[PDB]
mmCIF file of C-alpha atoms in Angstrom:
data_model
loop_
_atom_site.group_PDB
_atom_site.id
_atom_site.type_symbol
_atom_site.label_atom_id
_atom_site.label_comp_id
_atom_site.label_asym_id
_atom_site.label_seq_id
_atom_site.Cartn_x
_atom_site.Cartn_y
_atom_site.Cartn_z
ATOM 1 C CA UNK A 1 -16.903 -39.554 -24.823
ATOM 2 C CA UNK A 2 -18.020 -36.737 -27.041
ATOM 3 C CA UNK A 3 -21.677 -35.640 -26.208
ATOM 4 C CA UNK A 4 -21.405 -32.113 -26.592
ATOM 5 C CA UNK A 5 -19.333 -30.453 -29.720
ATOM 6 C CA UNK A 6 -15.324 -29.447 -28.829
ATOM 7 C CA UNK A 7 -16.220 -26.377 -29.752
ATOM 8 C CA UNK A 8 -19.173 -25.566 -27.554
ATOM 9 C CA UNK A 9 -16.575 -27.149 -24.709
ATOM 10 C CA UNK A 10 -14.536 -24.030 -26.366
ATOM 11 C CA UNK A 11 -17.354 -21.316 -25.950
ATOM 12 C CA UNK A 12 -18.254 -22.427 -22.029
ATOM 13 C CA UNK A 13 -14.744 -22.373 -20.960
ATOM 14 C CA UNK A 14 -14.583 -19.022 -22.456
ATOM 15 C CA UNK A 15 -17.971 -18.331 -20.438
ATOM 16 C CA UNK A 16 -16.338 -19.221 -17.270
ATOM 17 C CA UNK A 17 -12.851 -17.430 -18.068
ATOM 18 C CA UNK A 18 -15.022 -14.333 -18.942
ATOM 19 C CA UNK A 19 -17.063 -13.986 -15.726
ATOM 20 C CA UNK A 20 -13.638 -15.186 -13.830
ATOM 21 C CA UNK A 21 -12.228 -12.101 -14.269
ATOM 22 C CA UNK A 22 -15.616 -10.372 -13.503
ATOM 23 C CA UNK A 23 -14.976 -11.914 -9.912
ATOM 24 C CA UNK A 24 -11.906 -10.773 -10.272
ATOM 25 C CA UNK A 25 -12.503 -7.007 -11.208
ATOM 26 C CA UNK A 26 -15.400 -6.635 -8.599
ATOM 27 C CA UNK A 27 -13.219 -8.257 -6.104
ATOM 28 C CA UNK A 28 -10.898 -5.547 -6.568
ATOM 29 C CA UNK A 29 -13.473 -3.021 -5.170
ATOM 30 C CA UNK A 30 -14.074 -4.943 -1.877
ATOM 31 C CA UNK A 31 -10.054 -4.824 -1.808
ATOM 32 C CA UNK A 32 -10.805 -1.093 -2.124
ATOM 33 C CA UNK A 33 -13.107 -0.326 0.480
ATOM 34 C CA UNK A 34 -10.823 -1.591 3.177
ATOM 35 C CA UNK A 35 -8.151 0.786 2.332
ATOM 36 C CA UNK A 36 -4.974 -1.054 2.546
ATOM 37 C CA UNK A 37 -2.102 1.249 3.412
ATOM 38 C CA UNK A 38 0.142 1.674 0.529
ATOM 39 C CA UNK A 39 3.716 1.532 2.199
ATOM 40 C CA UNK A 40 5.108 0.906 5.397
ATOM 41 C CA UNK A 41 6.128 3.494 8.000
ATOM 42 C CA UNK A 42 4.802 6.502 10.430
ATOM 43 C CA UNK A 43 1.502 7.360 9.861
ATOM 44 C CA UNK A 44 -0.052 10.878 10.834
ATOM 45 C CA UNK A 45 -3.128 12.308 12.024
ATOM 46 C CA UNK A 46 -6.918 10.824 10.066
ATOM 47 C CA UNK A 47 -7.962 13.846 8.236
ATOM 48 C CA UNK A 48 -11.215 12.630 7.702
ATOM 49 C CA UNK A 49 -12.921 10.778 10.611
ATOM 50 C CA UNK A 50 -15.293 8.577 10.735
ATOM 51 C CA UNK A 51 -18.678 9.381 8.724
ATOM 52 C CA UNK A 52 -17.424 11.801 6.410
ATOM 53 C CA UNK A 53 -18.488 11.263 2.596
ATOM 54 C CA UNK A 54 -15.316 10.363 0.691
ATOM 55 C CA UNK A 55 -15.293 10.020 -3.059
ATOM 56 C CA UNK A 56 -13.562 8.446 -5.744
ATOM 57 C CA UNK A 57 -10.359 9.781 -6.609
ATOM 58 C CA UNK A 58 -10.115 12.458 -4.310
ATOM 59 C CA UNK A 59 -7.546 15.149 -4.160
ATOM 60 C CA UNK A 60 -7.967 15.713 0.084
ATOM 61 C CA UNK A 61 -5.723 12.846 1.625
ATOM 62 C CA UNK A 62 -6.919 11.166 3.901
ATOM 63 C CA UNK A 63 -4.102 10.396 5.947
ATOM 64 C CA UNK A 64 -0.142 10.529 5.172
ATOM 65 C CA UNK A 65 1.925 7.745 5.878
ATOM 66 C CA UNK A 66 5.715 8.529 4.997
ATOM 67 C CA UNK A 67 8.587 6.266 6.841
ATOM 68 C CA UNK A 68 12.189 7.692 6.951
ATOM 69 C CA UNK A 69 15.265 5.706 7.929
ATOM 70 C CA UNK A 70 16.984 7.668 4.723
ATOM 71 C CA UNK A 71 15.932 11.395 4.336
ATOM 72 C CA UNK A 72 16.697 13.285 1.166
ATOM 73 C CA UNK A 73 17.603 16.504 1.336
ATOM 74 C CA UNK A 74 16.996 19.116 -0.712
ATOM 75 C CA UNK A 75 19.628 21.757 -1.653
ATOM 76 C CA UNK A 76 19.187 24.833 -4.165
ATOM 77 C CA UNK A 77 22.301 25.881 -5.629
ATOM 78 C CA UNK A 78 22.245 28.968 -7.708
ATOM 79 C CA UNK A 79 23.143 28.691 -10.911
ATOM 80 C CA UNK A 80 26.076 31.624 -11.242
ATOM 81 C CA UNK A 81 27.966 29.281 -8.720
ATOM 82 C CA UNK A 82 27.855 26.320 -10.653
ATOM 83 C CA UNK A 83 29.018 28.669 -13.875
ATOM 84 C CA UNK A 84 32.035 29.767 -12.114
ATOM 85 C CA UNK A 85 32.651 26.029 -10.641
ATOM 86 C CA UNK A 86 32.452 25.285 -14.706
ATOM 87 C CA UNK A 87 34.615 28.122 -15.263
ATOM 88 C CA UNK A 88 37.464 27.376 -12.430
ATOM 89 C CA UNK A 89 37.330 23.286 -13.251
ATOM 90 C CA UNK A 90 38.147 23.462 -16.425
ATOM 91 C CA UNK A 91 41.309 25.953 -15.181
ATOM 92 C CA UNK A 92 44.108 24.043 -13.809
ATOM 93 C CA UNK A 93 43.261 26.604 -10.701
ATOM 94 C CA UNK A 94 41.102 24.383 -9.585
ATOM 95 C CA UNK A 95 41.104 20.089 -9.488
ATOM 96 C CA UNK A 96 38.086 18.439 -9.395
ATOM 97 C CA UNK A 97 37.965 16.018 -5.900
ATOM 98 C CA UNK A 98 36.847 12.658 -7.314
ATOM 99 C CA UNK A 99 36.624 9.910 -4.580
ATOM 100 C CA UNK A 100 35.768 12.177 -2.128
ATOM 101 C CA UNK A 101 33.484 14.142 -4.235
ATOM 102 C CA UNK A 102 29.935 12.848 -3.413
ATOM 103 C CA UNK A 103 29.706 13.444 0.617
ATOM 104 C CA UNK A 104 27.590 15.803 2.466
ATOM 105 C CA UNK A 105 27.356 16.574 5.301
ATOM 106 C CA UNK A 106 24.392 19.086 7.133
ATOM 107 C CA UNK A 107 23.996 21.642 9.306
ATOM 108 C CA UNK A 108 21.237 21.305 11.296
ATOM 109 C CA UNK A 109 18.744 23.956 13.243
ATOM 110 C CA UNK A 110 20.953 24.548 16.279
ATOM 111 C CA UNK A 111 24.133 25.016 14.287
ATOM 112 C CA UNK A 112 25.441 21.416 15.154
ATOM 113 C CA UNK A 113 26.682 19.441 12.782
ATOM 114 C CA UNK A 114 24.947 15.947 12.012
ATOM 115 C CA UNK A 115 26.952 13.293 13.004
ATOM 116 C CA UNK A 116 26.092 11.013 9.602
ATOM 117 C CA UNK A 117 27.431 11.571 6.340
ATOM 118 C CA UNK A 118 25.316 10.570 3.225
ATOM 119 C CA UNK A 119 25.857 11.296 -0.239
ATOM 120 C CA UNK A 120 24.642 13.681 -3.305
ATOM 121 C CA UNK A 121 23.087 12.120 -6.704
ATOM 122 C CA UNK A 122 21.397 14.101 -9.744
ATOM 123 C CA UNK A 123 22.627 17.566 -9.585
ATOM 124 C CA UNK A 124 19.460 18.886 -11.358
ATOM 125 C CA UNK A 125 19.175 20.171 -14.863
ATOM 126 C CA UNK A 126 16.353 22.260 -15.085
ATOM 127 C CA UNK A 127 16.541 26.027 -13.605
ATOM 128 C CA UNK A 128 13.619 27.599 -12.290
ATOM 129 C CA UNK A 129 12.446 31.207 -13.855
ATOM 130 C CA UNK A 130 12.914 33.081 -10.323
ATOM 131 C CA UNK A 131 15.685 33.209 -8.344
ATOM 132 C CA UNK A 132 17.645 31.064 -11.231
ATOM 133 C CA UNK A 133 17.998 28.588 -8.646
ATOM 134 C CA UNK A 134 19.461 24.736 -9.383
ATOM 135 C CA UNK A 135 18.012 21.955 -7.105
ATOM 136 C CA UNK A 136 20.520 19.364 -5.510
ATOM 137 C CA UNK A 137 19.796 15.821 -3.956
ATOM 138 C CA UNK A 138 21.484 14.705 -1.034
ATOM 139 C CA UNK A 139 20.445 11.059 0.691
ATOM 140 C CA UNK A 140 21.314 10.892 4.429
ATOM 141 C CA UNK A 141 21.064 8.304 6.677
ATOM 142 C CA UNK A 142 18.694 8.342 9.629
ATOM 143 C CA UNK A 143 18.761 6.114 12.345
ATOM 144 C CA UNK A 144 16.948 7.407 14.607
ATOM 145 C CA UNK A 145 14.176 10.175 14.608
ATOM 146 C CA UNK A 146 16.466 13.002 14.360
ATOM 147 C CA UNK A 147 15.819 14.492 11.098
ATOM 148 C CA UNK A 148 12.267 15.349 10.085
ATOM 149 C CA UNK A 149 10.825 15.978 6.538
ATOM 150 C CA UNK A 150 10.067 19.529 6.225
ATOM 151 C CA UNK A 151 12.684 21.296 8.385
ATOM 152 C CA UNK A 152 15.035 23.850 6.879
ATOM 153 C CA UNK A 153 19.019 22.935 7.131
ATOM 154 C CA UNK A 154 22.243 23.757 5.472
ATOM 155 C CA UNK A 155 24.291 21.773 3.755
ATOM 156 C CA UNK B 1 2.205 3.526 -7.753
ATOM 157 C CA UNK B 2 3.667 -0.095 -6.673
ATOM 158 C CA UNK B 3 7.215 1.039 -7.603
ATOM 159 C CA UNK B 4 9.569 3.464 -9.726
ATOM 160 C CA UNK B 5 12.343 2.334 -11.592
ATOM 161 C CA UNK B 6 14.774 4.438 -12.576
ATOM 162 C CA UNK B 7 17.649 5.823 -11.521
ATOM 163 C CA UNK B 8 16.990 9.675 -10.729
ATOM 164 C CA UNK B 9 19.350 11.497 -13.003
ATOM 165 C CA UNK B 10 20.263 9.183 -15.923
ATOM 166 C CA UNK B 11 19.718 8.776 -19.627
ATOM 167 C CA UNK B 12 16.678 7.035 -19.883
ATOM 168 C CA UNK B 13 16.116 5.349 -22.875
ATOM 169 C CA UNK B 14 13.161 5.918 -25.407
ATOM 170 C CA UNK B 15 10.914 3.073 -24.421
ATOM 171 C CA UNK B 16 12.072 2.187 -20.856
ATOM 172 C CA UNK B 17 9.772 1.514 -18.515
ATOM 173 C CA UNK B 18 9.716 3.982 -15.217
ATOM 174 C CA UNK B 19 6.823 3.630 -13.213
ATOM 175 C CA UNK B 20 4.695 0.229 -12.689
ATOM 176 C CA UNK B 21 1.109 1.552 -11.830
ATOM 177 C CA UNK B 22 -1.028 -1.437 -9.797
ATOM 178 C CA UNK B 23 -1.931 -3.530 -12.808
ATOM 179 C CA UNK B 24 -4.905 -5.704 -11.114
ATOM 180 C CA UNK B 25 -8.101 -4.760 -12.991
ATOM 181 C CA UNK B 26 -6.079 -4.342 -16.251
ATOM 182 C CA UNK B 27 -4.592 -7.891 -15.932
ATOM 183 C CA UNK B 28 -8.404 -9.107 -15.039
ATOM 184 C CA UNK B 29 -9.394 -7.265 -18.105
ATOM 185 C CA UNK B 30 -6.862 -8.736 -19.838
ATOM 186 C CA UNK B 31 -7.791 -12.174 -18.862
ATOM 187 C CA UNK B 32 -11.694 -11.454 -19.874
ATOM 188 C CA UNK B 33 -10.386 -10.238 -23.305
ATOM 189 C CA UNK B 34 -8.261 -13.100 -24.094
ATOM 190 C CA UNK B 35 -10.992 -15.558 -22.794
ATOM 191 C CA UNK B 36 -13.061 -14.410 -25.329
ATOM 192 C CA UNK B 37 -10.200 -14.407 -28.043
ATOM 193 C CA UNK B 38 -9.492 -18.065 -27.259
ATOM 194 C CA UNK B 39 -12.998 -19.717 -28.141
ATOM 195 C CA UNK B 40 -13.454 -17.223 -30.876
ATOM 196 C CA UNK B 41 -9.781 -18.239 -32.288
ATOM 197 C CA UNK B 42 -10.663 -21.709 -32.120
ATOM 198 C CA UNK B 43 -14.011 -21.045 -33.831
ATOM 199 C CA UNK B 44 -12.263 -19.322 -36.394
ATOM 200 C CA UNK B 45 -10.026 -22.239 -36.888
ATOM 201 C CA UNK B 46 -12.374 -25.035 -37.126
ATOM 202 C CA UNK B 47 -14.746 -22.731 -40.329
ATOM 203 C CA UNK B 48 -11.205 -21.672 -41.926
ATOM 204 C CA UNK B 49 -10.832 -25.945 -42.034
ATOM 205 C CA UNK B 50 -14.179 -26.422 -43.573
ATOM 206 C CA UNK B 51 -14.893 -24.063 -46.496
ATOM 207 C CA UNK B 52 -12.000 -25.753 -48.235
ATOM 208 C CA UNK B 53 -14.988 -28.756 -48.556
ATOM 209 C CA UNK B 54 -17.368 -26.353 -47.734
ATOM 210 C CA UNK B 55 -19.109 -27.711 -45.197
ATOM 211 C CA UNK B 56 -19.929 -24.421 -43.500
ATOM 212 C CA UNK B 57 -21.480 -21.628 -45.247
ATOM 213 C CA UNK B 58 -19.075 -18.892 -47.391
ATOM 214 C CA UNK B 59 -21.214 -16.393 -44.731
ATOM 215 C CA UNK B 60 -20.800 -18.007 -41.402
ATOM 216 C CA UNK B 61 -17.152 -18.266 -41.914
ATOM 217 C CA UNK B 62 -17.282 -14.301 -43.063
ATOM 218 C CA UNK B 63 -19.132 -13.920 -39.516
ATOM 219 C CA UNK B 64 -17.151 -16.372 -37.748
ATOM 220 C CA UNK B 65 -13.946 -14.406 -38.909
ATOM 221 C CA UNK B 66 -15.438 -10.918 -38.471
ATOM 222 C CA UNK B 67 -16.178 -12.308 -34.410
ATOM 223 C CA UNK B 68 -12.693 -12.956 -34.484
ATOM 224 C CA UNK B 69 -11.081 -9.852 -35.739
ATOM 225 C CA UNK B 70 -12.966 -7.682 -33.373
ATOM 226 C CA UNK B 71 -11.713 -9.973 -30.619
ATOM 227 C CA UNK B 72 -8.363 -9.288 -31.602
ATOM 228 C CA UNK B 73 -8.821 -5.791 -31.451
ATOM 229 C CA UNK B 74 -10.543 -5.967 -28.472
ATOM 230 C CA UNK B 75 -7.433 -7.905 -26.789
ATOM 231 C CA UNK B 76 -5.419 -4.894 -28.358
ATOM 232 C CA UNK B 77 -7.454 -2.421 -26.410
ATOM 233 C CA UNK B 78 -6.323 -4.343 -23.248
ATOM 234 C CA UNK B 79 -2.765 -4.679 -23.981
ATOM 235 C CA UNK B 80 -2.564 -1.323 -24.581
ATOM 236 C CA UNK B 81 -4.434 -0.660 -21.782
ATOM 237 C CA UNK B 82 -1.917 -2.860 -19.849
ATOM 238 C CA UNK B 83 0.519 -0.892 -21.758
ATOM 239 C CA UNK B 84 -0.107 2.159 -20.250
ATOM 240 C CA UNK B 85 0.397 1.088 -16.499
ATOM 241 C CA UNK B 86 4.289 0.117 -16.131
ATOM 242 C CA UNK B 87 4.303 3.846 -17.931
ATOM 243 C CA UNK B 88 7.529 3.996 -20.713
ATOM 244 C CA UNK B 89 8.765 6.999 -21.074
ATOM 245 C CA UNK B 90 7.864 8.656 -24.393
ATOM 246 C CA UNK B 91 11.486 10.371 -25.339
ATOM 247 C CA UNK B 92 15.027 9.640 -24.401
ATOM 248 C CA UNK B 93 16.868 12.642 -22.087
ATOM 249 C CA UNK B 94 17.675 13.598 -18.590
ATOM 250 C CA UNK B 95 15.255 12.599 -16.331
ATOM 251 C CA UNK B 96 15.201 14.600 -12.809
ATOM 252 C CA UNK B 97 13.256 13.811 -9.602
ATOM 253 C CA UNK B 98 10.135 12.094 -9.625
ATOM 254 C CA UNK B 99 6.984 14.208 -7.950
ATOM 255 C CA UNK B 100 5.026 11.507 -7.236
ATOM 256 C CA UNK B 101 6.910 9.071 -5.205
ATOM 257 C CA UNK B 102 5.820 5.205 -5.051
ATOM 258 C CA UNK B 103 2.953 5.022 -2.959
ATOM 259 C CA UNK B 104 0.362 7.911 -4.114
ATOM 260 C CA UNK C 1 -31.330 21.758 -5.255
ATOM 261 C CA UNK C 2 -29.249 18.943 -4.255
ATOM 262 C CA UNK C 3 -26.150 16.948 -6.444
ATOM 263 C CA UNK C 4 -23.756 14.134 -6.221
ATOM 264 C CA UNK C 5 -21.086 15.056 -3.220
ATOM 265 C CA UNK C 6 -20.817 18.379 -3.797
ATOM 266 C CA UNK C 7 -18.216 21.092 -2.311
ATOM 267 C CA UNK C 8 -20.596 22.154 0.493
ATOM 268 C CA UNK C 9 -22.508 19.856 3.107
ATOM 269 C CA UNK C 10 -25.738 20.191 4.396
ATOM 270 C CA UNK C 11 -25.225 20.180 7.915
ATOM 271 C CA UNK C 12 -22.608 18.545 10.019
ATOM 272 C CA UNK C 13 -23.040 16.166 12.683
ATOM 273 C CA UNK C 14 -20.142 16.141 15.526
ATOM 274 C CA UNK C 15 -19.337 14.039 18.633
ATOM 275 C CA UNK C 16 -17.740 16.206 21.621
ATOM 276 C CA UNK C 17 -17.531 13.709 24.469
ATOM 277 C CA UNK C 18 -14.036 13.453 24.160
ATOM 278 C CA UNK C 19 -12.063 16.156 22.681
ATOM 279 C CA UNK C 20 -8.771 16.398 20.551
ATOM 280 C CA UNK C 21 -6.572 19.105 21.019
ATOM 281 C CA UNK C 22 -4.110 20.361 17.929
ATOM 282 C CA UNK C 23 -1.119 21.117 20.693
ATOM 283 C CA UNK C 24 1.580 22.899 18.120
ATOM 284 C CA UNK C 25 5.327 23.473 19.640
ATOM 285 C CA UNK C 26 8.519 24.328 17.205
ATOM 286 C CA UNK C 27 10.416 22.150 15.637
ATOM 287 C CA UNK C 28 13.968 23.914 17.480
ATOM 288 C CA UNK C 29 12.577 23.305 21.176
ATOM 289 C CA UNK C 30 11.883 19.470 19.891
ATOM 290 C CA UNK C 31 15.604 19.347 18.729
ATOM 291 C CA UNK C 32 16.687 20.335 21.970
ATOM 292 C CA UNK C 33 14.227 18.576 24.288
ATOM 293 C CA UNK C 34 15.199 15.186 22.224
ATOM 294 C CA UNK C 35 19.227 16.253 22.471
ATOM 295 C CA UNK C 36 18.675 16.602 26.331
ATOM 296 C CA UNK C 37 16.647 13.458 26.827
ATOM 297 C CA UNK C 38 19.399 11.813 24.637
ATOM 298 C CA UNK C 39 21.793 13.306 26.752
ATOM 299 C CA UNK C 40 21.965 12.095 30.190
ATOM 300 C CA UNK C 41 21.530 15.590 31.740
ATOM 301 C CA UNK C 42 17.484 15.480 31.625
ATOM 302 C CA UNK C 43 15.796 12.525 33.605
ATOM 303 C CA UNK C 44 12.276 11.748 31.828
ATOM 304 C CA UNK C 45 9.455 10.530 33.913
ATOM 305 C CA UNK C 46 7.709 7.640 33.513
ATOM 306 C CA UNK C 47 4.072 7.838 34.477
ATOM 307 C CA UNK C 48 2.868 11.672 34.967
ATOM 308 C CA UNK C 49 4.736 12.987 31.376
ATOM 309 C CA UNK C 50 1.217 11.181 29.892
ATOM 310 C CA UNK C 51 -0.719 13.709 31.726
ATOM 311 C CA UNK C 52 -1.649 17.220 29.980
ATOM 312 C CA UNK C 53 -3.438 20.240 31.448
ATOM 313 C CA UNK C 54 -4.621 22.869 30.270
ATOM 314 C CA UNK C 55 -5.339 26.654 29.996
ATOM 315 C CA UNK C 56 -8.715 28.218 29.025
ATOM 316 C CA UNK C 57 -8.602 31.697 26.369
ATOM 317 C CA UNK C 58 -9.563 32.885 30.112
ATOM 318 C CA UNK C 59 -6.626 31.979 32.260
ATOM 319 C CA UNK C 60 -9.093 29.714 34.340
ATOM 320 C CA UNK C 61 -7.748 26.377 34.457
ATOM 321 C CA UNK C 62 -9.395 23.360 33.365
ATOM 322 C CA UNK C 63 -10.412 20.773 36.076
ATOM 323 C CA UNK C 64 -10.053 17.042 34.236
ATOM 324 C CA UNK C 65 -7.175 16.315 33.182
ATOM 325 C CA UNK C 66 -6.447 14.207 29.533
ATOM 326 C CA UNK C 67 -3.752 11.600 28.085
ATOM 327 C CA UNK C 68 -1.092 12.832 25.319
ATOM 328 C CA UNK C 69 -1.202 11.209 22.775
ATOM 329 C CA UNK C 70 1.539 11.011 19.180
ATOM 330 C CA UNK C 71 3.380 13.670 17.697
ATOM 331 C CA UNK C 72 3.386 14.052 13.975
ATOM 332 C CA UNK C 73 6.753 13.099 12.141
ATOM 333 C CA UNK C 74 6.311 15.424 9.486
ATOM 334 C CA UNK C 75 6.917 19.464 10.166
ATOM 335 C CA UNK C 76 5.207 21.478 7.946
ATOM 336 C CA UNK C 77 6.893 24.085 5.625
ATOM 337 C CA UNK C 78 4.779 27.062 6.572
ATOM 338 C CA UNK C 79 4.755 27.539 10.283
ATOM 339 C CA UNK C 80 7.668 25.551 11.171
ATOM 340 C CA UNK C 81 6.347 23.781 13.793
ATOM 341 C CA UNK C 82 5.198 20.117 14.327
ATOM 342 C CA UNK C 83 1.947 19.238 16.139
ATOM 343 C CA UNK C 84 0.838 17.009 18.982
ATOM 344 C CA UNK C 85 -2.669 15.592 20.379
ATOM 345 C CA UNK C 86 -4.501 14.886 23.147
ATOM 346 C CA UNK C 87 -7.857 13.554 24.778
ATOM 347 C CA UNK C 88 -9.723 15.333 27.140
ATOM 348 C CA UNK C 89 -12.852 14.107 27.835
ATOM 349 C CA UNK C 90 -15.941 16.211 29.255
ATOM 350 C CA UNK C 91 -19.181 14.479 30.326
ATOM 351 C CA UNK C 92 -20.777 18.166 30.422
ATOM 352 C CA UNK C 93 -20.240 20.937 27.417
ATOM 353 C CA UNK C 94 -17.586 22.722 29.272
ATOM 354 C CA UNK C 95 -14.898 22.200 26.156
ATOM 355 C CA UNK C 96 -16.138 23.259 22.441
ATOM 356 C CA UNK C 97 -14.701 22.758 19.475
ATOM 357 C CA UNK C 98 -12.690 26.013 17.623
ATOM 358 C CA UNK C 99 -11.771 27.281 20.595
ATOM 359 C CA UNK C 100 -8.120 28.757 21.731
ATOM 360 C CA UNK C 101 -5.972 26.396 24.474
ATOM 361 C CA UNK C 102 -3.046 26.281 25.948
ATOM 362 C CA UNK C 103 -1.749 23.036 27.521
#
């Protein structure tokens, strides 16, 4: 019935809004403190334990939680192999596979042969200054726990 | 990191987006900002409709439109803010594996 | 003079009434333990493979023995070798922590 101006309606609602999102933003820190894990999967060991100071933004994890049902593997190629691949393709000497082109399959640390076989994607571009080395991505399936991150195969 | 979204090893554009960094206190900042934009706006409106009869001071409208300006730049600051999470990728090339993976 | 979390602490306050032990084995004799078990040439027990032991920097055996517990998932790149745990409790101060143990 119009006791108060549309305006100062205007400036309260804005009031509200305002302090809202205050909620909102120091809501977001009591979301923080109970430290929601990130992504699904196997978590390790607690670094810290309970007690320990632990700051904002802090470079020491505090625990690692990685899941794996693919793995990617990573496969340095050096680069005067790909040269003479670049050389011997474009040489009738040599035809390039095509359909069959993209699987892998690894070697594993007893010398037996994995039984899965994934596939490559983004043959790297950039060389390092060392051994000249190019890096190559390979995505295999994983079932099971059979392969773990950090282990050194063939490929 | 909520997510990353590109394809590891393709041309990504000039502009596309890549990464989408958790955007909750920037979209709560955003929200403040264009709280405050809103009632200002409208105040802005209602002075811009009476100078032409002049009703309202030349100077309150100056001040009534200077309140609104800086609002507007303040909901810039946010956007751009809000900008910066879901990160775009500055220049157009090959793109290789990502260091961070979704998660950290 | 005193700051805001700095690198070094004060003094450090520890509980030692149980005890964790960093058990570290390589990552080829878990490939073949896990290929046996998978194969049906190994039978795994059910009940006493919880049970670990172990083996002072002394040779003199421990007398209470402690529950396994996980093994990490991730190998690390340096040593080669993935790590397990375990609880061992001790009422008295027999066990300390830093010290060498086989299990």
């Amino acid at each position: 019935d119009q006791a108060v101006s549309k305006q100062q309606y205007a400036d309260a609602n804005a009031a509200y809004l305002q302090s809202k999102a205050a909620v909102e933003q120091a809501r977001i820190n009591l979301r923080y403190t109970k430290v929601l894990s990130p992504i699904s999967g196997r978590i390790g060991r607690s670094a810290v334990t309970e007690g320990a100071l632990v700051t904002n933004g802090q470079a020491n994890a505090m625990a690692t939680v990685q899941q794996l049902d693919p793995i990617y593997v990573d496969v340095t190629q050096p680069s005067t192999a790909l040269l003479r691949l670049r050389r011997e393709l474009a040489s009738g000497q040599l035809e390039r596979a095509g359909d069959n082109a993209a699987k892998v399959s690894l070697k594993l640390e007893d010398g037996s042969q994995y039984p899965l076989e994934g596939r490559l994607e983004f043959s790297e571009v950039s060389v390092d200054e060392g051994t000249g080395s190019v890096t190559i991505r390979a995505v295999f399936p994983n079932p099971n726990n059979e392969l773990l991150p950090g282990m050194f195969v063939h490929a | 990191i909520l997510k990353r979204l590109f394809k590891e090893g393709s041309d990504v554009k000039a502009g596309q987006q890549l990464y989408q960094i958790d955007p909750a206190t920037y979209e709560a900042d955003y929200q403040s900002a264009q709280a405050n934009l809103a009632s200002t706006q409208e105040q802005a409106q209602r002075y811009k409709l009476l100078v032409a009869d002049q009703a309202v001071s030349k100077q309150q409208y100056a001040d009534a439109n200077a309140a609104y300006l800086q609002s507007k730049a303040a909901v810039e600051q946010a956007r751009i803010n809000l900008r910066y999470t879901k990160v775009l990728s500055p220049i157009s090339g090959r793109i290789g594996r990502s260091a961070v993976t979704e998660g950290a």
